[PDB]
Structure formats: C-alpha cells, structure tokens
Amino acid sequence: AAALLYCSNGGHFLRILPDGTVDGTRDRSDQHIQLQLSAESVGEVYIKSTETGQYLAMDTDGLLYGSQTPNEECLFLERLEENHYNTYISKKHAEKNWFVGLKKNGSCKRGPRTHYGQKAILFLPLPVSSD
Template sequence: MCLPPLYTTPSFFLVFYTLLLLGASSSRAEVLPKRFARSYIHLEGDVRWRRLYSAMHYFLTIDPSGKVRGTRSYCTNSIFQVYSINVGVVAIHSAGSGLYLAMDRRGNVYGEEDYGPNCRFRERIEENGYNSYSSERWSHQRHPMYVAMRRNGWVKMGRRTRHTHRSAHFLPFPI
C-alpha cells in the first residue's frame, strides 16, 4: 500500500499553519509594550484667573445686570475665574459681578447667577494661538455656537459664529 508523502496532505499544512499563528501571536504579545491608559484627572477642578482679550481688541466683561460686552478699559468685571470642569470643558465666572458666562439655545450670551448646564463651554486652542469657547450644550444646525465679539464691542449671536471667525478668538491673559 502506497501512502502520499506527509507534506502534501492538507491536514499537515493546516496543523503547521495553526501552530505558526499561535506561536506568532504569543511572541508578538511579549514584544509589544502594553499601552497605558491616559488620565487627565489632574486637569479637573483647576482654577485660572484670566482676562479674555478678543481679537477685536476688547476685553470681555459681564455687568452686574448680566449684560455681556467688550471694554477697552481695565475694570473688575473683566477679571474671570476659568474653572476646569472636565477635559476641555470650562466654566467662566466674573469675579467683579459674580455672574457666570452663559449661552441660551438661541445663541444669546448673558450672565447667569447660578452655575448650570448653559454655563459650560468647550475651550479650544486654535492654530493661531487664540482660544475659542463654544457652548457644550447648544448647537445650531449641528454647528457649535461660539462666544464672539463684534468690532464695536457688542457680543455676537452664537448661531452666526464659527471657530474660524476672528471674532470668536480670545487671548486669555493671566492676572
């Protein structure tokens, strides 16, 4: 009786291929280092004292009445505490007026007495070194609504802004 050679049978190749895969996967796991999980817990709860200087050459202020506008002079209403809520999410509190910067669903920017979901903003560092602040809660036609300032110092409606507009760019000056 004549048997075919061992290396031509399909079962031999299947067993050899399986052993090759098992050996490669176990040796590969030993060679690659384990990837560590990134933790940004140290960034939460950070408080920074800043004045937000717009690219339109105004400092952002919140009046005690809750009106948000720009000023070129130094006043205590333009000093902000920027609280880090989460990674990339901040709350902006005016030290002079005691109000939080907030944005409603229509894109109106105003001062709020109590901290709430309208007071949360995503802080983004742009390519030109400026920061932009968009509402975490609200968007307009799937576009984020940004805090922005006109050339005359009045605040723009959030639904008419994009992160590429210079009016939405702020430099956070440390105090």
C-alpha cells in the same frame, strides 16, 4: 482678578456687567472684566466672573448672561483654535459650533454665527492670578 479675556477682532476685551449683561470693550476694562475658568475637567469651563460672582452662560440666541447657576450653557469648552487663540464652545450646541465672539461695536454676538475662521472669535486669555 483671576483672569482676563482679550479678543484679536481688532483689539477688544470681553465685558461683564452686574445686571446679567455681557458685551465687549475697546479698552482694558478690568474694572468689570474679571473672570475665572472653572473647568469641569473636559475643557468645558464654568466662567465664574469673579467681579460679580456670575457664571458666563450662553442662551439659545448666543447671548451671554451673568448667571446665578452653573449649567450646561456656562460649560465653555476651551477650543483653542489650532492657533494660539483660545475660544469657548458653549457645550450644549457643540455640534452647531456655537462659539464666543465679539461684534465690532463692543457687542456679544454669538448664536449660530460665531465659528472659526472669523477674527470675531479670536480670543486670547490674558490671565491675571493676583488672588
């Protein structure tokens, strides 16, 4: 439903859980991982996780949560990694280059550690517009 988010940090997908929780998964688990990249024009997308209806929104520890509110944190700047891979700068900390990246053990590990070079942050939108 609408979009899928893959990570070439080995071979995982991003995962949204109803209880405001974001993590990763080694399976095509688009039972839960459904999303919508709802641009505020200038790359910064409001990722409305269609499944739950929750906005994919980074905290100041780089922990993504399932938000009820579209804000400066959910504004996920499509910073396509020069390479094919496309990954999301959390607007607020653009200068600290706070990116979206998956920890190996199916986890949402961002804060001040997710940045370019790392396969950790190698994301590939596999979007699925069945709506």
